[PDB]
Scaffold this active site. Structure first.
Site, PDB file in Angstrom:
ATOM      1  N   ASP A  34     -10.535 -17.487 -25.429  1.00 56.20           N
ATOM      2  CA  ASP A  34     -10.641 -16.044 -25.624  1.00 56.20           C
ATOM      3  C   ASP A  34      -9.415 -15.509 -26.381  1.00 56.20           C
ATOM      4  OD1 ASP A  34     -12.443 -15.410 -22.426  1.00 56.20           O
ATOM      5  OD2 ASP A  34     -13.147 -16.142 -24.389  1.00 56.20           O
TER       6      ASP A  34
ATOM      7  N   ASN B  61      -9.267 -16.009 -18.596  1.00 55.00           N
ATOM      8  CA  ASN B  61      -9.173 -16.587 -19.923  1.00 55.00           C
ATOM      9  C   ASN B  61      -8.737 -18.039 -19.903  1.00 55.00           C
ATOM     10  OD1 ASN B  61      -9.118 -13.633 -20.213  1.00 55.00           O
ATOM     11  ND2 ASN B  61      -8.314 -13.943 -22.222  1.00 55.00           N
TER      12      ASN B  61
ATOM     13  N   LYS C 276      -4.651 -13.962 -18.584  1.00 52.52           N
ATOM     14  CA  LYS C 276      -5.127 -13.684 -17.228  1.00 52.52           C
ATOM     15  C   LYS C 276      -6.021 -14.838 -16.800  1.00 52.52           C
ATOM     16  CE  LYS C 276      -8.826 -10.711 -18.399  1.00 52.52           C
ATOM     17  NZ  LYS C 276      -8.930 -10.935 -19.807  1.00 52.52           N
TER      18      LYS C 276
ATOM     19  N   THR D 273      -5.510  -6.099 -21.102  1.00 52.80           N
ATOM     20  CA  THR D 273      -6.148  -5.834 -19.831  1.00 52.80           C
ATOM     21  C   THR D 273      -5.189  -5.055 -18.961  1.00 52.80           C
ATOM     22  OG1 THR D 273      -7.503  -7.870 -19.956  1.00 52.80           O
ATOM     23  CG2 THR D 273      -7.201  -6.897 -17.766  1.00 52.80           C
TER      24      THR D 273
ATOM     25  N   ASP E 269      -3.714 -11.467 -24.159  1.00 46.68           N
ATOM     26  CA  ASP E 269      -4.712 -11.254 -23.097  1.00 46.68           C
ATOM     27  C   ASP E 269      -4.642 -12.354 -22.054  1.00 46.68           C
ATOM     28  OD1 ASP E 269      -6.772  -9.891 -21.722  1.00 46.68           O
ATOM     29  OD2 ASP E 269      -8.356 -10.968 -22.882  1.00 46.68           O
TER      30      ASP E 269
END
Ligand SMILES: c1cc2c(cc1C[NH2+]C1CCCC1)OCO2
Lengths: 351, 13
Positions: free
Chosen positions: A185, A172, A169, A202, A167
């Site tokens: 996260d 995070n 991005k 995502t 994840d």
């Protein structure tokens, strides 16, 4: 050849091997024997919500005895309903209690009650990369590169432990008081020997093989690094549309367009990360992460100095003191309510 | 034209 320097890089790669071997040994001790129930809710004053997400929120809290501030993730067990939502929650806590790296947020306590799960982590007051990026538009290439180098090292560490992050991005990534990254996260992280199959992440950052329902491996993280570097340097991600389904069609296509201000070195790196063909994707070839670390776009990067935090950061967040939340956006507050009856006790036995 | 706000990750697409 390109280097005349080559001896220094080789010795450097033997040292990486030595470091990762020790790191694995330390990880496995904590992975096999996880910590549990190291605090309770009334040990903390809850101050303010710092962000929200799947199943709850993260709050700034203050430890009553010590006065230390922490970020407490609160998950409503009754919102964690789907099978892979449950499994992912257990992954997160188990991985976080076992890892140790300069650019990974430290889990300090975890516990649960009748209604919720709690993970208490270091508080990183500089805010999310996301906010800073949206506010200034885009980062210059040296600024983006400084952050990218920290993600490269973090993924080299995680992948050596057979951990996929899944994840990446700007939301995070937090910016600490020295201007360095903290990855938080870990809700989508998983220990994987080989392939895994969950359709998760995502939309903008999903590798094509995830979208195509293929069994996939750690190379999805290197794809997502390409998306992150592009978004940092452009101000928007490469596969950009209003609806997820439109995003997915652009991702699979094998096409990417670059801003005219991107350097050719940057475009070359990104074409090799945002590579649909797994036999050609950087990070996934015989030389592994070194195809990335030795790329021309990183030629100015002192990898060891980044790890050792000796490089001056491009940006230091403003800080007004312990417990300052000025670098975070505001969110609606909701009172924590603990039911008199244990909820979902059997699904979270191991937490 | 695309999403500019915070993006939620999806646990099971
Ligand atoms: C992600 C997952 C969550 C969450 C919040 C988030 C969003 N990021 C956090 C917010 C502050 C910086 C880190 O509340 C419950 O589970």
């Amino acid at each position: 050849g390109h280097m005349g320097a080559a001896a220094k890089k080789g010795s450097e790669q033997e040292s990486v091997k030595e470091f990762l071997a020790k790191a694995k040994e330390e990880f496995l001790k904590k992975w096999e024997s996880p910590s549990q129930n190291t605090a309770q809710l009334d040990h903390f004053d809850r101050i303010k919500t710092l962000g929200t997400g799947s199943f709850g929120r993260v709050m700034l809290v203050k430890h009553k005895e010590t006065g230390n501030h922490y970020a407490m993730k609160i998950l409503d067990k009754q919102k964690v309903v789907k099978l892979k939502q449950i499994e992912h929650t257990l992954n997160e806590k188990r991985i976080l209690q076992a890892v140790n790296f300069p650019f990974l947020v430290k889990l300090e306590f975890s516990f649960k009650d009748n209604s919720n799960l709690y993970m208490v982590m270091e508080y990183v007051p500089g805010g999310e990369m996301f906010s800073h990026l949206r506010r200034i538009g885009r980062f210059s290439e040296p600024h983006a590169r400084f952050y990218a180098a920290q993600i490269v090292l973090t993924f080299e560490y995680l992948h050596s432990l057979d951990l996929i992050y899944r994840d990446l991005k700007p939301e995070n990534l937090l910016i600490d008081q020295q201007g360095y990254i903290q990855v938080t996260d870990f809700g989508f992280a998983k220990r994987v020997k080989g392939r895994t199959w969950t359709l998760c992440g995502t939309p903008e950052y999903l590798a094509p093989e995830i979208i195509l329902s293929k069994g996939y491996n750690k190379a999805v993280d290197w794809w997502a690094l390409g998306v992150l570097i592009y978004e940092m340097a452009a101000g928007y991600p490469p596969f950009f549309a209003d609806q997820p389904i439109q995003i997915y069609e652009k991702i699979v296509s094998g096409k990417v367009r670059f801003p005219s201000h991107f350097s050719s070195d940057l475009k070359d790196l990104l074409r090799n990360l945002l590579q649909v063909d797994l036999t050609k994707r950087f990070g996934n070839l015989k030389n592994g992460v070194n195809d990335i670390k030795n790329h021309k776009w990183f030629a100015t990067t002192d990898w060891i100095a980044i790890y050792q935090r000796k490089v001056e950061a491009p940006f230091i967040p403003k800080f007004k003191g312990p417990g300052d939340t000025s670098n975070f956006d505001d969110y609606e507050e909701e009172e924590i309510r603990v039911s008199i009856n244990e909820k979902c006790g059997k699904e979270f036995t191991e937490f | 034209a695309g999403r500019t706000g915070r993006r939620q990750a999806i646990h099971d697409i």
